[model samples]
Target: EFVAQISPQYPMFTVPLPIPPVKQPRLTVTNPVNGQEIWYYEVEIKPFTHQVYPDLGSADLVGYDGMSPGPTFQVPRGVETVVRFINNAEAPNSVHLHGSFSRAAFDGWAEDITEPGSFKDYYYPNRQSARTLWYHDHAMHITAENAYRGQAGLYMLTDPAEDALNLPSGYGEFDIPMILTSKQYTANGNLVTTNGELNSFWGDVIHVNGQPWPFKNVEPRKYRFRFLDAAVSRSFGLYFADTDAIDTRLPFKVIASDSGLLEHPADTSLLYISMAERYEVVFDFSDYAGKTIELRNLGGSIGGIGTDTDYDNTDKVMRFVVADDTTQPDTSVVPANLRDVPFPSPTTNTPRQFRFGRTGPTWTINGVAFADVQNRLLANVPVGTVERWELINAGNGWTHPIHIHLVDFKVISRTSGNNARTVMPYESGLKDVVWLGRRETVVVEAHYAPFPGVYMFHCHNLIHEDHDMMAAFNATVLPDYGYNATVFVDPMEELWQARPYELGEFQAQSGQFSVQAVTERIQTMAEYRPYAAAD
Candidate 1:
């Protein structure tokens, strides 16, 4: 099959893992009058050829701060990190800090491409809960190709609450960030993508932290592994096994997910990560001292769920060689209570549904491709209003990972498919990315706040996204947030007034939510409640 290419394993575990450097702010300042603090940073994006493997000549690629998996940014909670992204490469670049709360201006709008030789200021208010985020080129039309050519990095937002827990955060040694991607390289080591195919992009060789399937030595103990699947179209069923097969998988504790740490650690044997999905897992290798453990991919090269033979080497992510040296006692603890996760209750009686499927030659949401959509406004939600949006995969046999910018949502339930009526264990925590299996349905609720502007909700599979599987959503200002709605302000009455709702008002108006609501939606806001005032 085209999905399972030739993934050779001759030089397996021949290279050491590369950890992208943690970026330090170049300048820091506090607003004198308001006392608000901000840190300033500058990152340069340029074309640089780097060796994928020791033998395959350096593959021509573009990266940030001189590396493929770019540099990692550690931002303190409640403070703002202003990153000046300089694009020195030939192609226009737009950097998106996934999972960060960015106002529309700095939210890496698809069309807000920073032309070559120019720069853009991105503001990331690490005010949200602590979590692991990744940044990458999210430009219009070329996101897949550019990102595949090495435009990505990691972002760490930390605070005193999470810091007090004292997880295994010894940087490169104990707490590690792994950006996983797979690519097909030419004889000359040039990278290959979907070639703009209307289908999924699949590759055989896997790259972990921008290195061709590598390995690292660990002093048998507990370690925190931060994983991000940055592949174009591939998904990975990640698990650690004694050998090359997934059948011998070992168990791990999941402490956190895309949004942040779960209220309690959830243990699972296998984790299936889709494109752009992230998870922070803890593996205690103390039992396997002096042994070799391989983090193997569970299935096929396409979606990591298909049956495959022994030849495909991409199934193995990387290797971990546990050493018997207990130089220092393991200090990290998977605390019982990671954080308090407040699940949002949707004010509206009915949810807004988005249909994802193919319409003839193009992929679309709600029967229209982004390129052909008229208004480009999927929904104009108001700030402070908790809303539930249902995502349906109308595409048969194909799956898509849906990602919504700005707010982290609670995966309310998997209405259909896989674990029907319930969410996955890892999904017990909040998330910004959700997996929508073939013909499946998922409902998520988000309490929008802090800022209001235009944002995006789309498939994270770069290939599908570039093929017009993306759409725009607008967040309107709410009077409750210290704003007065003027005639100029759009009052989406139906959605806006649907709030301050009663206990049974939602189900009582059983007719309130349905296909009828979706078809005639705009349901417009009736200018938010009057006496409300902002803090």
Candidate 2:
């Protein structure tokens, strides 16, 4: 009999391991507008480590920088902040400050990376926003793995205009980060991270900021909660229901959405939140202060439940137990009038259209897969020009949630059944993430300004972004009169490459990371890969 040797970890896939939090995890964030420094603890993660799901409930799972759900950093509007980020993980990593008007270097484009034992400063100069933003690892082609290792956190940029209206503020009790995500657990209890195609598995266990359907004891009051869906492919519609212990029901108000405060309070019993989308809802548990309430997902609708049989059930997310005679702050009513955002017209007209589809396992923008030699699908827009993008989802296989770097945009309209629907209210505001359903199209409007550099737009699904379903664009000031408008660089030289793969470490292999992965896709330009074009 011959004996065969087996490797400890699979190729391109890391075995799950429990990485402890970093010692003295200190991360300082500065608000340039007010010149204020906000300090947060960094989550120290050891990459390629494997662990069991539901082992310590959801929250107990090891996170990249800190504990579950990571930390939340708040900054003021119109101010920029420099993030002195230190990655003590076992692999190379980068941070993308999602939902802000950040620079390309700080946008965390896949090619923009920091190696292990190195530190990078991410400067996020806020353009304008009152909505919630998030920070996560955006390594070139390994976003799915980096995110899986738990390198994500919350960032809130508030405007003085919205802050005047007092809202509930407290931690662990009053306010919380309701991150809606799903997970899959292995039979022996370890998390089965790989799928059939070597893709990361969507989990079976649901988590709310790292806890599995956690129950929090709260006082009878209004709480301002921020919601972020960090799941790879899951989208959710959230609702609150009365538990058996409660005789009365709680009424929640929808105050703001992904782009910030709504025109007015859109009173509703249920709210829809999709992947990479955020919602700021207020729950008035005053009626059931002494009872318990349950947060449940209606599931099955809006792509939450897949075509498969195993994921059809309506599951519970978390529990809110009201405290008896607790010290709570004065109540604030949902204002009848919020900030006003003008409708986006063709005022800044640069009609650019893009289509999303899969070629092999990689998704492409404008028909081209991201390659090292073909880093960008579009050129950078002038700083002050408003542009409209027509995004078409040409595939029937899956839905994609597209996201852009730097500025936020307004979702003008979307293609519905045989017609275009223009009755979207909240979408009229600035947005950084917009969804493109299967075989559907959406139009978005945004003005490019504030900062300039290489930026990106791609599917928010980590797996999709990791696999070449991503592209980059430059945002440079129009050159002083004489320079030619069209200039091209060699894709291979422009794209950032990583070192060769090492045995027990996670390092970027050149032509395997960031914009390089997009520009250097397997098919060579000379071979006639459709999207690869010579200048």
Candidate 3:
């Protein structure tokens, strides 16, 4: 019998990992009338050829501002940030400010699109607490392909409360952002994708911050890392494969969740992260000096009720070598209490239930296919109301990582097989995405704010979301409260169809008339209904 040879550890940590550069807004302007300063940034979506594997040569890719995992946005809390996004690629695209409390107009409505050579303005009101957010391509039909071509970046919001904690106060050195994604390449250097199935994308190569199998040199001190799961469908169970003599793995002190900080930090040897989820963790390397450690991915079942077998390449992520630098001071401390995240009261309207299932090859949310033209409201949530949503996975092999837009939610409970389970410690904080297993049901409580407009809730798996596993809902304000339909306007409908302003001309021609016209048009559209005044 012939034995197949496999290395005990793959990618022996030869290449040094490069840290993504921090980016600030190019221009800042104060609003003349309101005296509010707006930070403006320009991000262009263009084509480029980049080398993922040095041996495979260069592959054509698309990214923001010419770099994949585009520049990081370190935004200040309570400030208004505006991004002028230009789509110079060959396809249509939309920008979604994930985990932000943006208005419906800036929520990256799936139908709202910026065609090739077109541009759009996205405004983010950073009113929430400090957290790790991200922005990515959310085009109506091509989100998976667009994002797979490298069009995402980090958006970190800082606040006075978080600043007072003083946890690793430097970028790229003490504080780092780790974006994990996977990709598949063909023999001829083309990208491999599953065009037939509505399931997950299990790629062959894992990339951390746009590099394959890279290694980073860390000082012998404390470091804070913000990890973002940017994979289209894959989930990660991350742990350090190289452990101590007693088989104890490296631990991660989880301090924060999707949208905000947690009440207390939890130490865990393994961290499981799903698509579009963010976690802030701290690791101390004071004792691991002069040692190289491998970051490994413990494979598990993704969509169905099965387990994924670990491979030589997919199981390994990156390596970290503790540098022999003892001069740097270890000033950061992982406090016992990070921030107070009080759960919302369970008092809510009648709980609405949604079922995620697939009929043949098409994925559906409550048996309805997503139609961008049809403004079919799934549920009517009144503004300033706390609502409970029950997400049910309808007994299929498929699982959905449900993501609700506009507001953060608290994981109330999870029920499977007639028994309820308590929320995990890592998921007890404010979350915008929840993983649903086969035959499992998750219930979340959320308090919808007063931003009245249309928003979306869907599976974070870009493949499922793009294939019509999505629905829209409305946060409606009382009509008696001097409601203005013109306040929240759909720029794509107004500017694109009316042709008053050509594509890519919104910046130069944005004025009172253009704003008013879009608002009036929204009122006239039958799909948009003004909230009925309370009797």
Candidate 4:
């Protein structure tokens, strides 16, 4: 089957491997209504390690510790829990609960590494709106490569408030986790990863949960499929297509996005998903029952700055085989109105503002890059208090998506009110990561409570993060001992290896300069030259 569009010269092939599964992945649920432990599981932690090919098909990742795509932790809303993170691999791994509001200890910072022999307990109080959150490796510098190797999982948070509105749960075979990811292959088909500019830009393979061009048989019913674009850099505008390789104009309803449920579901023929973005969409296959429909990526059809040429010729990403039988089941149509939480007023905010920019390979937070300045990212806020942070994107050109580790925030306003409000519908709910457009200032109010320790805040753009756009902050629960603390960070080891300097000479020079200003009574002497004709 034709999986994705490319030249006939680069012909495609499919290799069907068993969907790697992890058994009894640990999950502990605590009652939020009452302080009681509900349930627990001795979770299995898996590793997904594979050789990457530059532009061809790749083999099933071998020697994984657990399973590819990690494990799924399903829990009800308004519940709290702690997952005892057990790292069984040789390499260090840290789990960052993407888009969920956990305490500082659980918000995996790259510096927060758990060695192979050791494990950390990540306590989460679950202050989230009912939606889909994910967990993946957030190691100091290797997060991109680790995620590429498949150390990721899905965490579904459900709540009574959302269930009361009634949305489709399981529509037989219709329900599927459509994870969009791409991989590269070499000419000889051995996975290629190089030290060159682009490391394994696997534009050849498009996979849905590790399966290559597999078709899912579905019944004629309303189906809710959560679409997550786990691609490294590619952003997709996805939809369904008819059997004849033609685009099918079936309008899909997008019920939720990013962190929480939308105020109301929006109707659109196409849904745009960015890297690390999660969207819940429903497809009614009643009309096309008994026929095969291919989910298509019309990214090229959108035709804008974000859309690239490689996505122009749309190919079948996955196929859905609709069963001839129809069922009269309880239908949960997209509710006309969803839950509306009160937006906290901005007037009650303690303001903490910062700007982001890029200088060489280092991305700066508030004019200073990581390791260059002292511990400045930390904000000392007392527990049970709220603070408003104004994030201004001041870059030479590129945009940055500023993200905080512990607390999720709501985007209050942007630099340009009218245009910002129009484009930022996806940013309404509580978000741990928010994209601050070029030269845009985003304001969000967040609270500090319960547990406390060192937290991190940084740019979500993995490239920027790899280049040093990351910084850490501290949150203290005790009022007697103020919330502030200094964090001394050593410069990146790679950078130090690349550029080494003598510490004694640097210290002597700095010491001399420190005294020069105070002791100097200096006079300027200059000489001017004149031509003979002037005399």
Candidate 5:
């Protein structure tokens, strides 16, 4: 059995895969003049105890709405949405909408958090294109442990452009959101994590949609799967284990990248996904009727370092069993042309360069640790300008997956030593997170949109980011240029006052402080918000 092969102490998959239900907010208010509607959603962060494996028993965990991976939010384009995040647990937390074009206040500033027994209302304009996004904890120092415990969810943005493609429609049936993550547990079912070893936490078991090595039965038809890598540090090199005589594996029809749909579809046999990255692909099971296929990981070292040698467990992710029903017709088609990506073509100014490396135990960018001071600004670009950035990984021992918030960038070139590589077909579209291998240099072209404010760029590895591998940049507008006060505002004061709690404080007080005690402690820190503002 898979359980015995790995470790008798670990748990195996005894329960079927569970699908996170799609949630819709209640209509709270309507404007009489413009007939505008506003929807409100309330989410709670609370403690949970559940049995991951039958033999290991239950373990203490924290989740959103009392469920791990939270709930799926199917939001429509152009909708004004507000989510009330309530922290009912002992620890502090913040929610970041990974791929949304949100304002600075709602962007989940690393320092902005909802303390225990406190809540915050985040607003979203939903003005971006349709794509597969996700919401997860982005708290300052404890992000790694908090996210590892369980605080994440799926968010699918839909518009008329994507709906016209005639792809898979039904959720949990034709279209599936696959949230991939990894974790390790002790014999008593207590979670185990190590952030001390180079700040990388690699789990021994794979969990898909909150279930361990679960199996899903699929009909002999075409299905669209949105794959999201939610691991804190692990990177996935995914492919089908079962192959043909020629060692050829099944191909995935990739149609979308991080931000949205690509210009066209590309067929790839293997998919490499870094932490916090997303990909929407389609697969047809018409030829493999009644056959069971296992999704496997090639188990390559992440960042070209560390060991993921638990082959008996880590190699196998999930199983897919194709139904023997031939009566169902496969009508879904991978269209030749998808959504067009508007890449900036204008000549950019002098390119800027940043180095990602480590000094002893602390992670740094450009030889400086993250701070709220203005001197730490990595780049300052004028509004409505395009710029090229060169990201170099000087560390020969580890790799980093750098993620830039607020805008999607196009990769121009990547070079490793004397060898130069072209951008992959799937990477030709818009991207927010790019993987930097050992001693690799990558250049990307990005357009700083007119949303003038301060935004952050950092490593997707939670431990590294918490330690200090992040920086902020300002998008300034010309003095004479008219700016939108309603949408954008200067956050200089907020940044200067921003201070994250210490890791020791979080570790010592988490799961120990009662909600009432926490509320009393942070009462002076809470800000007032009117109900009318939410509407």
Candidate 6:
């Protein structure tokens, strides 16, 4: 019934949405200090070219474990996870678990790149709450094209308490993890990287779960879709409608943001998601059985949401072909209340303003580029402090999705945007990536807890970030120095001293490294107990 409306223009919705596999640990190790089990994974990064879509040619791309949008790491809370990434490709690579509280050694410090054939072992302190996190290439300069060419994966932190909600969740059928990306291709299906300037890159073909305009056939029940915007710069204004008509639009409830579950399900008609943002949404397709629903976008290619003109007719996203005859009963119900994750209490009144703007040939933060700021400290946050920061788009030309690593913050309010003054409903949850449209200012409150080291906050518009639009901040242990008679020594000086990160044997002509050596290195560096905090 749904195929009648289709004239077969490039075979939209012909391909099924992909469900990336959950990576199994290569082995497990016990933390010597706490005796807790830590999951260790060994994955290889390489180049791959596959038939990504039925209508498209084999596009060249890079991936992890032989596929783009690499395998998902679904690890439980209270257990640490260490990943030894083997860079099998020709280019340099760095691994950054987007929302994890990794120390500076494992923080995917842009400069800590593992060259070809080299491997780096990174660790995650899964001590935080459950959340939808991701990992991607955070290489020093080519992060845009590098990750754009593929090299991103899902990293979810799960908790038993969250599973008790009985929300629709199953990797095989219901609980789906979707990595959203749009693309540009040549007539021959090769990647066309020159879509726009480095300031912005907008793809014409929208992809969900690695295929162009894929469709998912579902039983008439509620399903939880974990959405991650892996686009280089594209943002989405997502809404569902029947038969491509606006009058039959559907509403969905957002239960979680990039960090974790919200206090309650926030209902919204149109969900605006920016690059690097992860949203957990529940779509009830029960009533729409036997109907075809199209997820359309009203957000422009550049950024921001509106009834703006669609870029290259890229409004329509994926589709849902719901069947009513299925015998599966609807058991999932969205409770009026979800899990509670408290917001950061305000500790300082003077909000730090981070201005994003553009110079002649480069992107800048507060008019300073990454090269000028990566070495020095933008802000030194004490471990136990809660701080509010303002993200301001200085120019009215481009929009930016700012990602502050290591901590999940609450979206306080938007000073300027299409819908200003009050924050959007979905934004009520915790967030790591906050979008700032042209001339808009967004304020967020976050508690700097759990770790003490240097981390980065960059524009997730990988293009802007690659153009040197990144900066670093030091999360220092407050008690490291004296309370009163402190000398002029920079508190961040210790962290500034770089340590060798690559610890694999690349001389064997294979991507092989001694596991014992690798494990020892990870244990040594990952134990983030700073000198003063070790007590």
| Candidate 5 least-lDDT 10 residues | 525-534
Q: Please provide TM-scores, in order, for all candidate models, with all chains considered together.
A: 0.86, 0.76, 0.87, 0.73, 0.87, 0.89
**Which sequence of candidate numbers ranks them by TM-score, best first?**
6, 3, 5, 1, 2, 4
**lDDT tens digits, residue span 1-535, model 4:** 2234342233222332223342343333333334354333333344443433335554444122456665566677644554555555666777788876554445676766766644555545455677777777777766666666667667777777776766777422344566676655455554333123222232545667755455677677778887776655455667787776566567777777766777777777766565677888878888787888777775532223232235323344777778887766637667877768444444464568887776655667765655654764656666456678888775425555677765656677777322422235555556666656545677888765433555678876555565567776665554443222111112122111111223343335343122242122010000110011111
Candidate achieving the largest lDDT: 6
Give the whole-model CA lDDT for all candidates, comma-separated: 0.75, 0.59, 0.73, 0.57, 0.73, 0.76
lDDT by residue (346-387, candidate 5, tens digit) is: 565667998998866788888777754655677888867889
Cα deviation of 328 in candidate 3 (Å)? 1.3
The segments of candidate 3 whose C-alpha lies over 4 angstroms from its true place after superposition are 1-12, 194-197, 243-247, 302-310, 348-350, 372-376, 418-422, 483-485, 489-535
Give the range of the ten consecutive residues with the poorest summed lDDT in model 1.
522-531
User: Across residues 1-535, which tens digit of lDDT does each residue of candidate 2 receive?
Assistant: 1112111111111122111222331334443323444333323344433333323322223354445456667667754444545555566777787887554545676765767655554445554557788888887777775676567777777777776676665434455667777665544544545334223344555667654456677677777777888876666657788877332334577776676777776666666566688877888877776777788765444433221112422355677777775584556666778778643445655568887777766667766666644655565676567888888886555667788876668787787433423324545456778877656688888776545456788888777677667887766665562222122111122222222333223234233323334233322221221111111
lDDT of 4: 0.57
* lDDT computed for candidate 6: 0.76
lDDT string, candidate 1, 192-308, tens digits: 655656677767788899888899998889999999999888788888887634377799999999999988999988887889999999999999888889988766433423222
Q: Which sections of candidate 4 miss by over 4 Å?
A: 1-35, 42-65, 171-174, 188-190, 194-204, 243-249, 298-302, 305-316, 327-330, 348-356, 371-399, 413-421, 436-452, 475-478, 481-535
How far residue 330's Cα lies from its native spot in candidate 1, in Å, is 1.0
Which residue pairs clash in candidate 3? Answer: none
Task: Name model 1 segments beyond 4 Å from true.
Answer: 1-4, 7-10, 244-246, 300-311, 346-348, 416-422, 478-535
State the displacement of the C-alpha of residue 298, model 2, in Å, after optimal TM-score superposition: 2.5
